Design a protein around this nucleic acid. Structure first.
Lengths: 114, 96, 179, 190
RNA sequence: AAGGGCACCACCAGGAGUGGAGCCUGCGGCUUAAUUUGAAACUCACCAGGUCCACACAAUAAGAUUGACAGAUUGAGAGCUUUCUUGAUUUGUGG
RNA sequence: GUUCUGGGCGCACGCGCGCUACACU
RNA sequence: AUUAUUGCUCUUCAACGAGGAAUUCCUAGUAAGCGCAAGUCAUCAGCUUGCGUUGAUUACGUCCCUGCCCUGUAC
């Protein structure tokens, strides 16, 4: 099974955010201790409604919030992440925990000097 | 009778230069796709005030371009380019 | 101290204005307490927002600092011209003409500032019963803006021409002949 | 200085690739490869073209010259890479041996290089790409410059490759020595 | 309309170096939606995507219009649901 | 025009000013 | 602070053996070695200017090279 720093997947999802922050490395702990802004609350509000009404997957919700931490409450959701130009569609698998959303949408093309 | 009397249908496209720099100017409305700016890149430009110039490259997705000219331009000038098409005579019939 | 609300005045134009400032006009002492908000630190967007919220004692605000910020904004601006939101606030002023004249008019009596101010004062209509008083005060080149205020097309106005009888001074005198 | 553009006109008309920029240089600029020399005296280019043409008329491993006019020269583009970054060739003993025999040929043709060194050899498996300030075999310092080349190539094989009828181990003699066409192009020393 | 003078941005006698390796950085070129001409926001001037904003005739109004609680809608939102409040500027065609 | 959110100020290569070294001073 | 500002700890250990053709600065408390302070600045320099510490070798000349300034015939 999946496990995070020794905590098993089935005890995750039950774990709250304010519990989860105790496991995370220093960058995450400072970010929450310094007080995360209100802006995720509206995103979280919408994301819950889509999951609850879902028939099976919840279909994408899209956002500009690239600087947002992935947190267990949102596991399994499908999200469209803005790219400065387009939206990229991603599904929150459990391995994504503690990463920033921005890591999944590439702001620049490759270059090949053709 | 002279079949060599070639007729060419001339066309003039025109666009507005709107931002100005010490080495380049950029022009709107002449094209609307980056693909078009690239396809017609090689044709020389001229101002009606008489300066010549050339396309550098496409800028952005709306078909803006930026270009270089013989000297200072300003928004009171217009940028044009000329194109030519072959024409042929039609036949004729008696009248009574 | 009111600076706990006044500290936000440097950015209030980005969105919904604070209720701790927007409620301030509800207090009759606010004509003196409003100076406790540090209004000179207010961004022009809030000055425009405050101008819409400031709507005869209101002339004590319009002339008490608003015209001072106007002259400071044009005189302090690196291009010598009022900022858009100050200009939009100025044109958004004048909702009472006697306040515009009694506050912004006679106390305003360089030439580059008079021309810019006139370019707003021609932008909207005015009541003829007020314009008759404006001509009498203008009948008192910094007064040459009276050649624009008369361009809108009373027995005391005829008498003012008899008491008043550059190319703008001759041109304004010619326009005063148009009947 | 519009000649810096208009000089093309003979080559532009007589020559078909557009070519591409390869590098700015101090004496000349290089751009299927075109070399442009650097107001009057450079029309030097004829000296270079005839010199290269002669050596390529011989059997030497040099690029074929195609055409030359108005201080413009066109040459075969090189396929290899610069020797100074070579580290692992599969037959270093034959490579050492035969670089030595190349010097013998120049001496038999009466010529000596000034700087037969890794900055102008490109990767027999190799080609020699230019001949700055060449001298005749008759010049008063010919042997001094001759031995410098031999030791220069020996030093490289020692330091990087650790190497240290033919020449070297497996042949009767370790390396050539000075005592063991100039009049057509009298670069120096008749 | 050939001689003379002078200078380590010239040399001579030398010193310390550059050019060779890794990295920082300026320009050209390449790439890209844009890579604008003591840059994480702004700066910022570039890109994608969102709101919001003369006069003369004919129509129109004592309700022309203005403003404000609680709540709303998008990828980016605020007195649009609700209902009080104020009192002379709105819609077409010809600068 | 005004203003808000996100992005940008990448590298096959050529030229130049620098930093750190190749050790026993 | 993700495509990562800076600092700390452990681990990984690349090229490089004094560098071709070319080429820069300099005559005494000067060159060179070494470090500090200010500047910009929420944070962030291997940058710029100033300051101090240690402290040489080689000329005291010339028109060879480069460049500048004076006074009609093979061009």
């Amino acid at each position: 099974t999946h496990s995070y720093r020794g905590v098993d997947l089935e005890k995750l999802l039950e774990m709250s955010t304010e519990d989860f922050v105790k496991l995370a490395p220093a960058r995450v702990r400072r970010r929450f201790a310094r007080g995360m802004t209100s802006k995720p609350a509206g995103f979280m509000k919408k994301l819950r409604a889509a999951k609850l009404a879902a028939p099976e997957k919840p279909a994408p919700v899209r956002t500009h919030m690239r600087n947002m931490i992935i947190v267990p409450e949102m596991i399994g959701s499908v999200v469209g992440i803005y790219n400065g130009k387009a939206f990229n569609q991603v599904e929150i698998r459990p391995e994504m925990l503690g990463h920033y959303l921005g890591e999944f949408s590439i702001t620049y093309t490759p270059v090949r000097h053709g | 009778a002279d079949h060599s009397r070639i007729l060419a249908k001339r066309a003039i496209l025109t666009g507005h230069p709107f931002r100005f720099h010490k080495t380049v100017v950029t022009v709107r409305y002449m094209f609307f796709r980056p693909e078009d700016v690239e396809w017609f890149k090689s044709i020389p430009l001229f101002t009606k005030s008489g300066r010549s110039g050339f396309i550098k490259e496409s800028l952005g997705t709306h078909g803006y371009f930026k270009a270089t000219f013989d000297g200072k331009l300003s928004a009171q000038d217009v940028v044009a380019m000329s194109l030519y098409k072959r024409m042929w005579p039609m036949p004729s019939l008696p009248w009574n | 101290a009111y600076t706990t609300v006044g500290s936000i005045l440097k950015t209030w134009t980005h969105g919904k204005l604070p209720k701790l400032f927007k409620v301030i006009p509800s207090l009759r002492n606010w004509q003196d307490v409003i100076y406790v908000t540090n209004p000179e630190e207010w961004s022009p967007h809030v000055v425009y927002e405050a101008t819409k919220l400031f709507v005869k004692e209101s002339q004590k605000f319009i002339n008490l600092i608003l015209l001072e910020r106007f002259r400071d904004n044009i005189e302090t601006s690196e291009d010598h011209s009022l900022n858009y939101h100050i200009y939009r606030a100025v044109k958004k002023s004048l909702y009472k003409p006697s306040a515009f004249f009694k506050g912004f008019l006679f106390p305003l009596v360089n030439v580059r500032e008079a021309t810019i101010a006139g370019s707003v004062l021609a932008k909207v209509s005015v009541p003829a019963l007020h314009s008759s008083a404006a001509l009498s005060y203008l009948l008192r080149p910094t007064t040459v803006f009276i050649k624009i205020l008369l361009d809108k097309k009373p027995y005391q106005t005829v008498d003012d021409c008899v008491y008043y009888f550059p190319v703008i001074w001759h041109k304004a005198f010619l326009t005063f002949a148009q009947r | 200085n519009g000649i810096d553009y208009l000089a093309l006109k003979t080559m532009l008309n007589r020559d078909y690739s557009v070519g591409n920029t390869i590098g700015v240089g101090k004496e000349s600029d290089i751009y299927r490869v075109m070399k442009i020399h650097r107001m009057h005296l450079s029309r030097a280019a004829n000296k270079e073209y005839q010199f290269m043409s002669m050596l390529y008329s011989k059997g030497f491993k040099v690029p074929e010259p195609f055409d030359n006019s108005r201080h413009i020269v066109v040459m075969e583009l090189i396929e290899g890479y610069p020797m100074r970054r070579l580290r692992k060739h599969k037959n270093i003993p034959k490579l050492y041996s035969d670089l030595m025999c190349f010097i013998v040929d120049l001496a038999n043709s009466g010529l000596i290089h000034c700087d037969f060194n890794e900055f102008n050899i490109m990767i027999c498996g190799f080609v020699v790409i230019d001949f700055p300030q060449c001298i005749s075999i008759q010049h008063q310092d010919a042997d001094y410059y001759f031995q410098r080349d031999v030791d220069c190539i020996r030093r490289f094989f020692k330091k990087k490759l650790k190497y240290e009828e033919g020449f070297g181990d497996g042949y009767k003699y370790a390396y050539p020595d000075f005592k063991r066409l100039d009049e057509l192009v009298q670069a120096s020393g008749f």
